[PDB]
Design a protein around this ligand. Structure first.
Ligand code: NA
Ligand SMILES: [Zn+2]
Ligand SMILES: [Zn+2]
Lengths: 457, 451
């Protein structure tokens, strides 16, 4: 009776970032011109939103943290997965196997630059634990399978607190998860009974050394959890470091008078980013040396034509690295053979231009082993997704503050972001969301969509 | 296509849609099996170009922006003709377009941005198109910003000088007005400077009959109406402890100041509002943005100030009707003002009502009825607030020296698009913003109850 389902409307809502009253006015104004099979009522959309939420008795929103009980979240997901299977009349109901993925990561944030003058409340540092469902197995066969195993569209939020990622809080979160994992592991839906097998694979290198108290093969033709956030930042930094040394073109600035003009070049480029782009590109807040958020790296690659004029780097190289990071962070399906050729050539262009600066471990793992990592669905979006939430609460806090107190508006923000994270990671809602945002449509390059083989023009 | 490019462009403004929100909205609407809905953004952008006057006086500096009204009137006349049902007006030997003009200034507070951020805007409104004395076209919203054509806005504090400076600078371009041309008809222009308050009139020159309601002390500025009523309510709130008009008295000043800071503190911990904060010269630099938030939540403001909630919402509903620019049910408004007035004396007969509150409640119906409400000012404020947002977006991809003009360039255009006669003819009766904020009593006064 309506072109857009209430759930499909909710998709269009997220894909466009439309407000409640923009959608109501969009509806009314589109009716008054003679067509009502298009959009449902917002009453129907609000109900579709409510259907994504888990029960209110399992959701803990403080002025600090936010937590869902892992039992409640898995059961919620199972139900919404069944509503996307073509004919959920499966034969094995004695046992279904839902294979799921989990992990955690942390991101930082800065609201312009405001020291001794705070623009609101919030630690500007978020720590999020997430879960992703992978395969639905009955007697050894695939019944339903995740179409985007590394997209944030299936990155369910479990518990995010606005705390810095300590070695302790990592171990604290592992045992806090392992216990609620090791304790309860059943589920029920639509007559079938579903057990859960969880794998902690959304983990980077530093977390692994924590949990244990503690190499290429020489790189054959004839590897770890790659964070989208970590890839985007450590490549910007690698490109910046090359830019500072363009005067002498040597990896080590240890030589006679090289350090003298590296700092000279670095200050020229730092100033160029501030007045040409309003970017604090390498400005340090004494937190071991590089307080560059994912926001800073995102804007460093947003305009390859301009970053090259600022840094003195080659535009071809910069655009190549940006297109790659876009494909990674989209969460969409990447044409692995088409990607490997693009990565293999980007590497060739690197040594063509800057063979003197050795490739960072992150750049090596990206360009040289990135094709395989994509192919084995081993890319971790908790990082970038955790940051995008932080940017979105500080936005919500500045909106709620105008009619609520600080301690109350700070929780109304944690309440709303948990919801926004649930709708966006909902299997039935994500089942009909556009392959690329209005944001992704505007920003992604010609080469990027070509790598994603997207017919979502 | 269901939406015309101009009608889509209206939907664009009414929703505050970005270029890429509209493109994705279109694509996503096709991908679900329906094309006939929205036109291309190139066709929408072409419609935007059609509102602009030529390179004749695209004058956007790092400071000001100005259009010659000859180019603007000819522009307006042409866009007015595109809205008449049957332009078979036989009498074309002389057409009389009667238009309205004036100017007003607004201030602003928030220094990280660029700009003096105090704006002074001169605007023009077309009223009637006369053929041999007969109505050919008539303004459907004579006080709405939807027909408030911008002539020149400079970022200057409204000085005594710049008023007279603007008066003769406008007066000269008047006598030099050649009759406009469109569709074989010849249109002469008669302008009246009535969008003017009492302040401007005493400059140019170097009352109640014992009250009788069934210009009217010059009219009513929407910007000044919201501020001078908020301030009147606050002054009542500060003196609630002793219930006397005079702030003098035995230690009254001591507890009046105590109440004023109590309420000022409530408006910060509850609302993040600077209610009477001064940055220059022992003053009361309350923005039009500040008055909008003072009335946005009458149930909450009343707990803060200790005032009667009914009264606050009543004053808010009225100021919303005034500022909407839409047509107000004059008989239904007069009854609403005349009852709000009764409620005022019911609660606070001890505080004499300010002249602005008197003019509104007692003479406001008639001022509405004679379309004597001036939106210059609030429009200048919404423009000023909208440049600071473009500056914050353009700066993040452009230098300051260019972003300071790219903002002035874009704001003049959006003031033109919003004041374009053909676009406003098919614009939604009330914004997406007005949907969320306007109260039931407000919509009923505009009689938009079912839209
Ligand atoms: Na508005
Ligand atoms: Zn290797
Ligand atoms: Zn009177």
């Amino acid at each position: 009776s309506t072109i857009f389902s209430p759930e499909k409307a909710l998709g269009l809502l997220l894909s466009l970032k439309l407000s409640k009253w923009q959608y109501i006015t969009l509806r009314e104004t589109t009716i008054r011109e003679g067509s009502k099979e298009i959009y449902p009522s917002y009453y129907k959309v609000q109900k579709a939103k409510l259907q994504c939420y888990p029960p209110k008795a399992f959701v803990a929103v403080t002025d600090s943290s936010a937590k869902i009980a892992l039992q409640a979240l898995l059961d919620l997901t199972v139900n919404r997965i069944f509503e996307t299977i073509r004919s959920p009349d499966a034969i094995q109901n004695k046992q279904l196997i839902l294979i799921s993925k989990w992990g955690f990561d942390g991101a930082s944030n800065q609201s312009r630059y405001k020291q001794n003058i705070e623009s609101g409340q919030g630690d500007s540092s978020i720590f999020m634990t997430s879960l992703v469902p992978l395969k639905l197995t009955a007697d050894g066969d695939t019944v339903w399978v995740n179409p985007k195993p590394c997209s944030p569209m299936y990155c369910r939020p479990v518990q995010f607190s606005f705390v810095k990622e300590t070695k302790d809080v990592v171990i604290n979160e592992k045992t806090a998860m392992d216990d609620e994992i090791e304790a309860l592991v059943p589920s029920k839906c639509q007559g079938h009974e579903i057990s859960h097998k969880l794998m902690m694979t959304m983990i980077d290198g530093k977390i692994c050394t924590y949990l244990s108290e503690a190499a290429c093969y020489l790189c054959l033709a004839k590897e770890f959890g790659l964070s989208t956030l970590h890839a985007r930042i450590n490549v910007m930094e690698c490109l910046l470091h090359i830019a500072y040394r363009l005067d002498f073109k040597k990896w080590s600035a240890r030589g006679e008078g090289h350090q003298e003009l590296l700092h000279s070049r670095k200050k020229l480029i730092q100033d160029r980013f501030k007045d040409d782009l309003n970017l604090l590109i390498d400005i340090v807040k004494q937190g071991s040396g590089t307080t560059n958020d994912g926001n800073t790296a995102r804007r460093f690659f947003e305009f390859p034509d301009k970053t090259a004029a600022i840094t003195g780097l080659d535009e071809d190289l910069i655009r190549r690295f940006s297109v790659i990071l876009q494909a990674i962070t989209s969460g969409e399906i990447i044409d692995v053979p088409k990607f490997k050729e693009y990565a293999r050539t980007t590497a060739e262009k690197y040594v063509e231009l800057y063979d003197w600066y050795y490739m960072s471990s992150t750049v090596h793992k990206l360009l040289i082993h990135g094709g395989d990592i994509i192919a084995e669905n081993a890319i971790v979006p908790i990082g970038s997704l955790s940051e995008e939430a932080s940017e979105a609460r500080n936005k919500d806090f500045r909106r709620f503050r105008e009619h609520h107190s600080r301690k109350k508006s700070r929780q109304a923000s944690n309440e709303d972001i948990l919801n926004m994270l649930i709708i966006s990671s909902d299997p039935l809602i994500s089942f009909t969301r556009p392959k690329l945002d209005a944001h992704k449509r505007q920003t992604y390059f010609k080469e990027t969509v070509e790598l994603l083989q997207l017919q979502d023009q």
